[PDB]
Design a protein around this ligand. Structure first.
Ligand SMILES: *[C@@H]1O[C@H](CO)[C@@H](O)[C@H](O)[C@H]1NC(C)=O
Ligand SMILES: *[C@@H]1O[C@H](CO)[C@@H](O)[C@H](O)[C@H]1NC(C)=O
Ligand SMILES: *[C@@H]1O[C@H](CO)[C@@H](O)[C@H](O)[C@H]1NC(C)=O
Ligand SMILES: *[C@@H]1O[C@H](CO)[C@@H](O)[C@H](O)[C@H]1NC(C)=O
Ligand SMILES: *[C@@H]1O[C@H](CO)[C@@H](O)[C@H](O)[C@H]1NC(C)=O
Ligand SMILES: *[C@@H]1O[C@H](CO)[C@@H](O)[C@H](O)[C@H]1NC(C)=O
Ligand SMILES: *[C@@H]1O[C@H](CO)[C@@H](O)[C@H](O)[C@H]1NC(C)=O
Ligand SMILES: *[C@@H]1O[C@H](CO)[C@@H](O)[C@H](O)[C@H]1NC(C)=O
Ligand SMILES: *[C@@H]1O[C@H](CO)[C@@H](O)[C@H](O)[C@H]1NC(C)=O
Ligand SMILES: *[C@@H]1O[C@H](CO)[C@@H](O)[C@H](O)[C@H]1NC(C)=O
Lengths: 228, 208, 342
């Protein structure tokens, strides 16, 4: 039975180098190539390159030329991956793979039947930044028989996560806190909203409580209708 | 070179998933399944050949450059992300997630101008909320002085609500303070099965 | 009526009994004398499909060359499987001779005679023969040496050009000499001389042929991306000594775009600790012999790999390949296939 076993996950900073291994067994190691594929949530899986144990022949994806090195140890039947100059875009789960068809005479590299269990690698700055919390105000005229929407926009923090509660958790009904998005700036943002009876806008006070543990930040923001 | 569609399928157990991949080149096409927190698994290779262990509910077809993976009678183990592959090239992936059926519900639409507090920062964020709707499929388009906007918005969607089985979505339009003050009318247009026509919520910048 | 089949071929040669040369001695015990009057029957109105990349003649030649090297080029030390084997390693006489492969009774070899045949697909002029031409079992990487030349144009060979995992064989129609030398009185230092005028013209023609197969994209050469010395350098055996020559200068993109004309001298070194192409492990040999070590060869082919990746660039990058010695035999056996008569 063919098996591929990979080294454990690791956390890196920008600029660092990473090294992972993949130990193969259950077949003749030199008969077929080993590939490296990285999966990042939301992105297409990316082929990094293959390596043929025979003489350690390699082929690297063009876009990774100069940053990547694939080697192997013949005795321990182990393949190795090194990736230099890490950035946030390198955050991914890394797999080694081998084709389904592999004999002593012939192979087809690309039908990946065999995958290692995967090696998660996170590449992030050690710096932290607290959220900016802006209100999302209801409306102008209070309709006595309708429902109003309000919330607060939680912008430009790093890293994940932030959590939001309302009135210190007293208000839960109709609350939607959205999954964060990663902005072009490299910083995260999310929105938290809640629907409430429009008749309570002049009576009830609505505070969103924002928590961001990495920056040790807790901020309360009162969301009220704009005066005009 | 590999165009996989759609991005997301929201289906109930028992239904059938239809996933398609358009190619432009020559070679055998494979399909992979990635279950949550697991390594990808070879499902199909060479267009329609089922890998070992794969039940016949999975089947691959091909018409011209269009390859299709159809999964009949969906089970729990079938949900996850699917990828087509040709040589070193992979599709963007299709997320097949569990959807619980309910009646059609139109979204309540709300638009939020940028805060005055934020406008001090030099940036402006306009938020559009689509609240409590079903099914998941919804289109949001931003218009600024009746001009279609592209590349300056991001959306986020909630997981299906465990109580009323609805979804909610927020779209954020981000502009610079200078670019924001250049225009007057800001609108988000919402199209959804529960609306007889697309609904537009808007405000005129400045006036309250 | 015949069908494609495989069998146990026998070998023929012109090995001499008085020669102490290694290949000769092997062929003396393993082969029969060649036929002075070989017969070739040209088949009319006969179209046959060939596939050089799935030709089992190649598998048998591989077995023979391994057996030859194993029975001759015995290392002082054989480092394999964690264990250490110490044998006697005397200096030998080494010079590959032509070897013919032939079919037994009931089987015949079909030979493709299309001048522009690329290795796979149908063939119009087909002939019938009992034996192949004389093939020298030259073991090398990056460059094919002392082989046959293409008839008409330069021929690009690959099981599938769209597949970056598949080796590319460039078959030249004009040989270019390479003159390697280890002068007498660092004893392990050597060099190869190549006429830069002939090579750069040939190399230019190679890029133009590749343009035809890659939509007129910019064709760029690069040194290997990594691997053992046997493949990152031009590896070959001359007079029993293992040579490792650096080929960075042989693939000068500047000289195929002034001043590059002249004589190219590649830095070579004779190693004693080598990785065996038999897929075994490491072998340790004696220090090089004294005197002038020299051998002149014909570059008749080039082994290339093509870069891949999720890109959109308008240039294709090629790098000197090799390491799979079975490919060396494919480059000569490409026009032959074994069939069985009923
Ligand atoms: C080239 O590869 C395709 C699949 O990638 C295969 O179907 C075809 O037979 C190959 N061609 C040759 C000549 O081997
Ligand atoms: C193939 O056919 C032509 C025409 O009969 C002949 O002249 C040519 O020599 C043949 N090719 C070979 C290699 O014999
Ligand atoms: C060789 O010729 C066959 C038959 O026309 C063709 O299918 C194949 O693509 C060619 N291969 C190369 C490498 O040109
Ligand atoms: C080398 O090439 C020349 C012509 O360029 C040829 O005459 C000679 O026989 C070749 N040597 C070999 C094949 O050993
Ligand atoms: C070799 O082939 C090339 C085409 O790739 C051609 O330009 C050249 O004239 C040929 N050499 C000959 C016929 O000697
Ligand atoms: C090969 O080069 C050496 C010097 O490096 C020279 O003496 C010899 O004559 C050359 N051989 C040929 C055939 O040109
Ligand atoms: C290289 O070969 C050319 C013929 O192609 C010849 O005229 C020239 O003299 C050679 N160069 C040297 C330095 O010998
Ligand atoms: C080959 O020679 C070039 C000459 O500058 C050198 O830079 C390169 O490192 C050499 N390659 C190897 C594998 O030693
Ligand atoms: C290519 O030739 C130029 C000009 O002779 C030279 O400067 C350069 O080093 C050469 N490139 C190599 C040897 O890779
Ligand atoms: C090629 O053949 C010539 C004689 O035909 C010989 O001197 C030379 O050593 C051979 N080259 C190799 C690498 O065997």
């Amino acid at each position: 039975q063919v098996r591929l076993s990979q080294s454990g996950g690791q956390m890196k900073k920008p600029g660092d180098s990473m090294r992972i291994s993949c130990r193969a067994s259950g077949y003749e190691f030199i008969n077929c190539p080993i590939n490296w594929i990285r999966l990042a949530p939301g992105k297409r899986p990316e082929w990094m390159g293959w390596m043929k144990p025979r003489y350690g022949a390699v082929s690297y994806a063009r876009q990774l030329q100069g940053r990547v090195t694939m080697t192997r140890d013949m005795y321990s039947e182990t393949a190795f991956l090194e990736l230099r100059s890490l950035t946030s875009d390198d955050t991914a789960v890394y797999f080694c793979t081998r084709g389904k068809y592999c004999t002593a005479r012939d192979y087809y590299n690309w039908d990946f039947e065999h995958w290692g269990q995967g090696t998660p690698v996170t590449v992030s700055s050690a710096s932290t930044k607290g959220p900016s919390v802006f209100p999302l105000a209801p409306s102008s005229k209070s309709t006595s028989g309708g429902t109003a929407a309000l919330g607060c926009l939680v912008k430009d923090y790093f890293p994940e996560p932030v959590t939001v509660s309302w009135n210190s958790g007293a208000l839960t009904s109709g609350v939607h806190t959205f999954p964060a998005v990663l902005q072009s700036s490299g910083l995260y943002s999310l929105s938290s909203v809640v629907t409430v009876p429009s008749s309570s806008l002049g009576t009830q006070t609505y505070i969103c409580n924002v928590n961001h543990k990495p920056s040790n930040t807790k901020v309360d923001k009162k969301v009220e209708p704009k005066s005009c | 070179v590999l165009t996989q569609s759609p991005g997301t399928l929201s289906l109930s157990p028992g239904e059938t998933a239809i996933i398609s991949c358009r190619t432009s080149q020559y070679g055998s096409l494979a399909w992979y399944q990635q279950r949550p927190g697991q390594a990808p698994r070879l499902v199909i290779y060479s267009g329609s050949t089922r890998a070992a262990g794969i039940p016949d509910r999975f089947s691959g077809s091909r018409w011209g450059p269009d390859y299709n993976l159809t999964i009949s009678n969906l089970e729990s183990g079938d949900f996850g992300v699917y990828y087509c592959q040709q040589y070193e090239f992979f599709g963007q992936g299709t997320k097949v997630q569990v959807d619980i059926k309910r009646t059609v519900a139109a979204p309540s639409v709300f638009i939020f101008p940028p805060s005055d507090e934020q406008l001090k920062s030099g940036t402006a964020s306009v938020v559009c909320l689509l609240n409590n709707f079903y099914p998941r499929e919804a289109k949001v388009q931003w218009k600024v002085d009746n001009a279609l906007q592209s590349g300056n918005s991001q959306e986020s969607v909630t997981e299906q609500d465990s109580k009323d089985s609805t979804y909610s979505l927020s779209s954020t339009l981000t502009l610079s303070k200078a670019d924001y003050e250049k225009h007057k009318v800001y609108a988000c247009e919402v199209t959804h099965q529960g609306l007889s026509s697309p609904v537009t919520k808007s405000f005129n910048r400045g006036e309250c | 009526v015949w069908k494609d089949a495989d069998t146990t071929l026998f070998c023929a040669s012109d090995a001499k009994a008085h020669e102490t040369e290694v290949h000769n001695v092997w062929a003396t015990h393993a082969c029969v004398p060649t036929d002075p009057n070989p017969q070739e029957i040209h088949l009319e109105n006969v179209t046959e499909n060939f596939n050089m990349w799935k030709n089992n003649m190649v598998e048998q030649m591989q077995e023979d060359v391994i057996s030859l090297w194993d029975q001759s080029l015995q290392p002082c030390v054989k480092l394999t499987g964690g264990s250490v084997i110490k044998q006697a390693c005397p200096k030998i006489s080494f010079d590959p001779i032509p070897i013919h492969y032939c079919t037994p009774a009931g089987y015949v070899i079909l030979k493709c005679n299309d001048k522009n045949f690329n290795g796979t697909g149908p063939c119009k002029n087909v002939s019938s023969v009992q034996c192949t031409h004389g093939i020298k079992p030259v073991v090398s990487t990056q460059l094919l040496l002392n082989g046959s030349l293409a008839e008409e144009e330069i021929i690009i060979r690959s099981e599938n050009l769209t597949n970056n995992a598949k080796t590319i064989i460039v078959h030249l129609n004009k040989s270019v000499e390479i003159n390697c030398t280890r002068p007498s009185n660092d004893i392990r230092k050597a060099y190869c001389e190549i006429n830069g005028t002939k090579w750069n013209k040939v190399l230019k023609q190679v890029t133009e042929k590749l343009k035809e197969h890659f939509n007129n994209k910019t064709i760029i050469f690069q040194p290997p991306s990594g691997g053992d010395l046997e493949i990152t350098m031009h590896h070959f055996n001359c007079r029993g000594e293992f040579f490792y020559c650096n080929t960075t200068q042989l693939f000068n993109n500047t000289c195929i775009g002034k001043g590059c004309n002249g004589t190219i001298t590649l830095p070579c070194k004779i190693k004693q600790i080598i990785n065996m192409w038999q897929g075994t492990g490491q072998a340790m040999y004696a220090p090089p012999i004294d005197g002038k070590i020299n051998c002149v060869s014909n570059i008749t082919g080039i082994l290339l790999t093509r870069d891949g990746g999720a890109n959109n660039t308008s240039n294709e990058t090629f790098r000197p390949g090799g390491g799979n010695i079975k490919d060396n035999w494919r480059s000569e056996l490409y026009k032959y296939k074994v069939v069985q008569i009923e």
